[PDB]
Design an enzyme around this catalytic site. Structure first.
Site, PDB file in Angstrom:
ATOM      1  N   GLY A   1       4.993   8.094  -3.594  1.00 36.21           N
ATOM      2  CA  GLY A   1       5.782   8.472  -2.390  1.00 36.21           C
ATOM      3  C   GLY A   1       6.908   7.468  -2.117  1.00 36.21           C
ATOM      4  O   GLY A   1       6.696   6.273  -2.163  1.00 36.21           O
TER       5      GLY A   1
ATOM      6  N   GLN B   1      14.627   3.049   1.509  1.00 33.78           N
ATOM      7  CA  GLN B   1      14.673   2.159   0.327  1.00 33.78           C
ATOM      8  C   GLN B   1      15.899   2.465  -0.515  1.00 33.78           C
ATOM      9  O   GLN B   1      16.195   1.694  -1.403  1.00 33.78           O
ATOM     10  CB  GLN B   1      13.368   2.312  -0.460  1.00 33.78           C
ATOM     11  CG  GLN B   1      12.320   2.693   0.581  1.00 33.78           C
ATOM     12  CD  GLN B   1      10.885   2.559   0.077  1.00 33.78           C
ATOM     13  OE1 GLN B   1      10.025   3.356   0.400  1.00 33.78           O
ATOM     14  NE2 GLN B   1      10.576   1.561  -0.702  1.00 33.78           N
TER      15      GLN B   1
ATOM     16  N   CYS C   1       4.174   0.219  -4.538  1.00 37.27           N
ATOM     17  CA  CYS C   1       5.189   1.239  -4.159  1.00 37.27           C
ATOM     18  C   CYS C   1       6.391   1.137  -5.104  1.00 37.27           C
ATOM     19  O   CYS C   1       6.217   1.226  -6.304  1.00 37.27           O
ATOM     20  CB  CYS C   1       5.506   0.945  -2.693  1.00 37.27           C
ATOM     21  SG  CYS C   1       6.636   1.957  -1.713  1.00 37.27           S
ATOM     22  N   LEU C   2       7.571   0.955  -4.574  1.00 40.73           N
ATOM     23  CA  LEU C   2       8.771   0.850  -5.456  1.00 40.73           C
ATOM     24  C   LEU C   2       9.467  -0.498  -5.270  1.00 40.73           C
ATOM     25  O   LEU C   2       9.364  -1.356  -6.125  1.00 40.73           O
ATOM     26  CB  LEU C   2       9.740   1.976  -5.107  1.00 40.73           C
ATOM     27  CG  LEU C   2       9.113   3.337  -5.415  1.00 40.73           C
ATOM     28  CD1 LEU C   2      10.016   4.399  -4.797  1.00 40.73           C
ATOM     29  CD2 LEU C   2       9.095   3.556  -6.929  1.00 40.73           C
TER      30      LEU C   2
ATOM     31  N   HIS D   1       2.017   4.706   4.129  1.00 38.52           N
ATOM     32  CA  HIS D   1       2.775   3.617   3.467  1.00 38.52           C
ATOM     33  C   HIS D   1       4.282   3.739   3.716  1.00 38.52           C
ATOM     34  O   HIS D   1       4.912   2.889   4.317  1.00 38.52           O
ATOM     35  CB  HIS D   1       2.419   3.725   1.995  1.00 38.52           C
ATOM     36  CG  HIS D   1       3.062   2.576   1.234  1.00 38.52           C
ATOM     37  ND1 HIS D   1       2.379   1.684   0.583  1.00 38.52           N
ATOM     38  CD2 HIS D   1       4.387   2.232   1.055  1.00 38.52           C
ATOM     39  CE1 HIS D   1       3.205   0.843   0.037  1.00 38.52           C
ATOM     40  NE2 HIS D   1       4.444   1.154   0.311  1.00 38.52           N
ATOM     41  N   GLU D   2       4.813   4.827   3.225  1.00 40.65           N
ATOM     42  CA  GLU D   2       6.272   5.062   3.401  1.00 40.65           C
ATOM     43  C   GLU D   2       6.683   4.963   4.870  1.00 40.65           C
ATOM     44  O   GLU D   2       7.796   4.595   5.183  1.00 40.65           O
ATOM     45  CB  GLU D   2       6.670   6.450   2.926  1.00 40.65           C
ATOM     46  CG  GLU D   2       6.407   6.685   1.439  1.00 40.65           C
ATOM     47  CD  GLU D   2       6.586   5.406   0.623  1.00 40.65           C
ATOM     48  OE1 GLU D   2       7.720   4.966   0.534  1.00 40.65           O
ATOM     49  OE2 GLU D   2       5.565   4.950   0.137  1.00 40.65           O
TER      50      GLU D   2
ATOM     51  N   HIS E   1       7.364   1.638   5.984  1.00 43.92           N
ATOM     52  CA  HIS E   1       8.761   1.319   5.564  1.00 43.92           C
ATOM     53  C   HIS E   1       9.809   1.873   6.532  1.00 43.92           C
ATOM     54  O   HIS E   1      10.717   1.166   6.921  1.00 43.92           O
ATOM     55  CB  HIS E   1       9.060   1.897   4.180  1.00 43.92           C
ATOM     56  CG  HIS E   1       8.340   1.073   3.126  1.00 43.92           C
ATOM     57  ND1 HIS E   1       8.314  -0.229   3.148  1.00 43.92           N
ATOM     58  CD2 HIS E   1       7.622   1.450   2.002  1.00 43.92           C
ATOM     59  CE1 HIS E   1       7.634  -0.634   2.117  1.00 43.92           C
ATOM     60  NE2 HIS E   1       7.206   0.367   1.406  1.00 43.92           N
TER      61      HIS E   1
END
Ligand code: NI
Length: 146
Positions: A44, A49, A89-90, A131-132, A135
């Protein structure tokens, strides 16, 4: 794909603005997210980001471009259970986390077009979004790590 950033950053830890209505421009970002989110290594992605202060996040928890999810203004409604994921994550660096997140969650979002849905997730998709969202509001999941 898009210009995603790494940590620590500004966007990544900055806040976004929630929207009320959607269009075929959000659809547009959303896809750009799949496109990217995929390309790299996340289930996800949040749209804080790449470089944006809106609420758009996508999910891909299946195996073959099967379960391609979207969430524009997913406010949280319910959150049952408290699990974590042994994943990264990323943006994130070399390390991965076992972050204490929630386990199941029920939200209310708008989609690619601006269609409102009340979506519930369990164990990991549940995480993907949770999670996202950290962010979208300014925290990377480097709070529960550091
Ligand atoms: Ni993350």
């Amino acid at each position: 794909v898009l210009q995603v950033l790494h940590i620590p950053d500004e966007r990544l830890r900055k806040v976004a603005k929630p929207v009320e209505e959607v269009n075929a421009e959000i659809q547009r970002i959303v896809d750009d997210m799949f496109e990217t989110m995929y390309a790299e290594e996340g289930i996800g992605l949040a749209a804080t980001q790449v470089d944006i202060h809106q609420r758009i996040i996508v999910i891909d928890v299946s195996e073959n471009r099967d379960e391609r999810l979207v969430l524009i203004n997913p406010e949280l409604l319910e959150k049952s259970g408290e699990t974590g994921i042994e994943e990264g994550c990323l943006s994130i660096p070399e390390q991965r986390a076992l972050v204490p997140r929630a386990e199941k969650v029920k939200i209310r979002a708008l989609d690619r077009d601006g269609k409102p849905f009340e979506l519930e997730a369990d164990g990991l998709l549940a995480i993907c979004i949770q999670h996202e969202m950290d962010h979208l509001v300014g925290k990377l999941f480097m709070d529960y790590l550091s």
